[PDB]
Amino acid sequence: MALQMVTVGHNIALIQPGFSLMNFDGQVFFFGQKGWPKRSCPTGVFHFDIKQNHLKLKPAIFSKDSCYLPPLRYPATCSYKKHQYIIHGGKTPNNELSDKIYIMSVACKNNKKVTFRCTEKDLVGDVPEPRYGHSIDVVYSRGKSMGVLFGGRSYMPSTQRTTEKWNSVADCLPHVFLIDFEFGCATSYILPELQDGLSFHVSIARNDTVYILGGHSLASNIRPANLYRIRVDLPLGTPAVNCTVLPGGISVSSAILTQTNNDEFVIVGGYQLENQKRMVCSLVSLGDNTIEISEMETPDWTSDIKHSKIWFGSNMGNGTIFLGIPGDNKMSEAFYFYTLRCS
């Protein structure tokens, strides 16, 4: 809705597609920097401080017991609750996929210079696989919080992976991994509703259900207008997860999801297909067992954006959307950036 071109001159080159913002008590934090962490910010996590619509990436630091995680681009970022961000998968700047989980909590807040605890979490049980473009989102069944990890892109399995098609990605087997974090375990669930691998799909967990929206399936190269609803029921014993392919789903990929109000998210941006990006921001108003994908007032998209073949971003967290578009000339102006404040 409220579009405003952001300015950043220093550390701009670090904002690459696949970056993942994390809202920690209003303080927005960049992650997924371009390249490996430089000694300016050896962590790769930055304060995403937009003042007067000028963006400053302030080098953040980590805890001592922290795991200095790699800059993961296109990982699965959720908020477990503490308010620690789960980060699964992602492309290590070596174009390696991370099987690791990274629970980035905030350990200490001083100067508004926040120290992080990027605790590595290993996944006992059914480790999903090294993947990216996937979704992780915590459901809350019976007071038990459990990450729901739905597939994204992964490199071909090392058995089928060839160097002539090394970086060839396949949408992971569409499975719903129940990542337990108090148990560090993951449990895959082959849902018959999810048989077309997805990636770069916006995912919305409200209480116990994860609305998987849009996405892209390489097995089809289409962005299916699907709205899978993965309802998770966690009894004390073996869990349960049931998907229901609801209608009204939108065909969008790489979309950004920001919660404007409680149970009212905005799926802005993304892609309807390759050379046609979703320039129509959508509203997703949720309920206990319902979901409505409206079509918000298409923002005053700048010509730079309307004509930007590629466009990426992440949910700053409050109601805002950081949104970058390649504006390169070939050069610390590769990506012209914008903030879309919704409500």
């Binding site: 050896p42 001592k64 970086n167």
Partner: protein, 548 residues
Amino acid sequence: SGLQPAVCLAIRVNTFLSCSQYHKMYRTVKAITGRQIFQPLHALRNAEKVLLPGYHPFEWQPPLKNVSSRTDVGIIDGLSGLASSVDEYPVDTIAKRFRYDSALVSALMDMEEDILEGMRSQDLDDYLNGPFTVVVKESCDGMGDVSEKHGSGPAVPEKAVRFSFTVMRITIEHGSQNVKVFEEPKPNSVLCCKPLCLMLADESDHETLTAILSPLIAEREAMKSSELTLEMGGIPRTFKFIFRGTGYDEKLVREVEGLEASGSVYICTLCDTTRLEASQNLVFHSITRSHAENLQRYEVWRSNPYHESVEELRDRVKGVSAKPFIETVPSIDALHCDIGNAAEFYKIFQLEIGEVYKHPNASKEERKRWQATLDKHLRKRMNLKPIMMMNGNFARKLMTQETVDAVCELIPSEERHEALRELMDLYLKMKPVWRSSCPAKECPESLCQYSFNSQRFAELLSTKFKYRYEGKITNYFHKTLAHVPEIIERDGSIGAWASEGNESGNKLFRRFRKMNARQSKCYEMEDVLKHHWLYTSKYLQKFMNAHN
């Protein structure tokens, strides 16, 4: 008549003749003589197949993990299935590469005759199938100023990355000793640095670089753990492979070996020493670092299994904050060592002109004035003009005793004159060692005295030039002084293992992109790679040395 298509192709590529200009010449000759002396372009293009990868049948025992056994694979998209989907990372790069398997195979089969000649010259049966250890000089360099073309395709940078490989030393195990059936006589020749991947990317763009090269690194690791059965000279010969990644400049080494930039307090890609420690010790550093150690150290940095601050953690890993992407050898880029050491001598001259040994502080523009003095004089006496960024020829006309004489003409203190003359005398008693392709056979006692001359260089640096080397030292001085003897006793040479060859290959990449390639993004890299592979064909080079 009398000119086979392979010979015509050798004439074409080695003479840098474009297919268009070669066709002009061929049709002109066919019209003037009537005879078809030169073979037509199609015959050349068919001869290329024999020389390009994807022609000779080979196998790997064990078969290469994650590598297509298909021997029909020549030039492939370096993207390597990398999705250019808008949803994915915006790969903006034209990458074309030979499959490392096929590239090694074509490079060997191209040296088939050379290998047989050398195993005959080594008093061996040239029908030996015994395992040949093929020591390969992996070489990668970013180029820059690679003007991108209008037209279809990505918005590639005006930069290139050329992963090459020079087959440096084929040695077969004839019982006990590793008899050397072939040694690249000119290892830093552009005629020998076989191109393997030309990507229109930036080596500083680690994401793209890695997406393009990790196929090559995967092939390289597979080949390390395998043995290439290859039908050479009618006999199936087995080639073990030793990939020595050395033609990477220190910037690129650090990028790919997970290290901090060259400006990092952690100063070497070989030792875990701080720039300060390196300015204090300056000569006594083992070669600590390695791709395996750097991998363990990135794993430490990431997992932080000791729950350390970023500073003490960095110290624990000694600058390895990034994951080593390439298994480079902890060596020295003799080329860029000359460059950097000569740039440091150039600044040293600037300072001596400024008497900074007497005037620690000095105006920035007064330093520019010293630099201009040095420039005007080097132009007057050494005749070598001022250059924006130091190049090797400048570093050679400058790392000269007559150059230091000329500079001394700009210094009133004859004590500084002798300090500089001694510094250069030592640097030139040392430079043969890390520039010689075989210092044991080109500068043996300059090497035996290398530890001593380096100790003396360090003494002169921390005593007579301590205004420049107190708590700081150039990384290439540290390498020159501390690690060169170790690298000699390990690799046998340093100059042989330099990026010099792949940089000359950058020259030829420019030449081929401008004059021997389809000027379309879709095909520039494919054609440049094809032609730069043929240029490096020891077979075509043989044909071009037929006068001998």
